[PDB]
Amino acid sequence: APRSVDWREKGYVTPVKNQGQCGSCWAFSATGALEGQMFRKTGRLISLSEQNLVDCSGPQGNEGCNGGLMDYAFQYVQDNGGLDSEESYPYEATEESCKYNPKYSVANDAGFVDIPKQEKALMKAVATVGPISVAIDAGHESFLFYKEGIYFEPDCSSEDMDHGVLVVGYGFESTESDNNKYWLVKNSWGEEWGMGGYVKMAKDRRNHCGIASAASYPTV
Ligand SMILES: *[C@@H](O)[C@H](CCCC)NC(=O)[C@H](CC(C)C)NC(=O)OCc1ccccc1
Numbered sequence: 001a002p003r004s005v006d007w008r009e010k011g012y013v014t015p016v017k018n019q020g021q022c023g024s025c026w027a028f029s030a031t032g033a034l035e036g037q038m039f040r041k042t043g044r045l046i047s048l049s050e051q052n053l054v055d056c057s058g059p060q061g062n063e064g065c066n067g068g069l070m071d072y073a074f075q076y077v078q079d080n081g082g083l084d085s086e087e088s089y090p091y092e093a094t095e096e097s098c099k100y101n102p103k104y105s106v107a108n109d110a111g112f113v114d115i116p117k118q119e120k121a122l123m124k125a126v127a128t129v130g131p132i133s134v135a136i137d138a139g140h141e142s143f144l145f146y147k148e149g150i151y152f153e154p155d156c157s158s159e160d161m162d163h164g165v166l167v168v169g170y171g172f173e174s175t176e177s178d179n180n181k182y183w184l185v186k187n188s189w190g191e192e193w194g195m196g197g198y199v200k201m202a203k204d205r206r207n208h209c210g211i212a213s214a215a216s217y218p219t220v
Contacts, residue, residue: 016197020093029164030073064095
């Protein structure tokens with residue numbers, strides 16, 4: 001595989017969004033992956049409605065601001081036959097009744113693909129598919145205060161993940177400890193968090209924070 005990948009340079013990635021104080025990270029991860037695969041198909045990048053997912057994908061297993069899973073969001077888009085644009089169905093950071101309108105649907109999917117639970121498989125997927133939805137253990141103060149560099153949290157769990165994010169690439173940079181590889185990860189906490197809203201998370205360090213444990217993408 002390549003040593004470095006960044007799908008933002010290829011037009012696959014919308015700006016960083018802000019989920020607010022609603023536990024809807026799974027919806028932002030899912031819209032990010034679907035924005036990438038829709039762009040791969042149509043050559044058009046269109047921001048998608050997380051609120052549509054929060055309000056409407058309960059039947060697939062999601063629980064609004066109380067959490068959810070990207071694969072359940074991809075299943076909703078398939079079952080529902082569409083997903084509204086961000087513009088048409090803007091984000092309100094609280095769960096309400098479903099207001100999906102098919103006339104404003106701008107995306108579709110035909111299911112999803114789950115990646116084997118190995119960083120080598122995640123790397124192949126990021127290199128060939130586009131941005132990938134992943135789950136990580138983000139439950140540490142070090143993740144709140146991240147500014148730059150490669151994020152490594154010795155207490156991070158590889159099995160207990162609590163936050164969905166989007167891997168848009170990977171790369172390397174020289175470091176003191178010579179653990180130099182990272183996943184380039186788009187978060188949904190606004191652009192004031194991290195490096196313009198992104199974090200470089202340790203790569204090939206025993207599946208740090210579980211980044212390869214629940215990785216998937218929608219089939220478009
Ligand atoms: C991220 O904002 C939220 C915060 C949840 C607490 C309010 N995290 C999730 O949604 C998390 C993401 C996965 C690890 C990818 N999932 C979650 O909390 O799921 C709970 C749940 C599981 C299955 C079905 C419904 C709810």
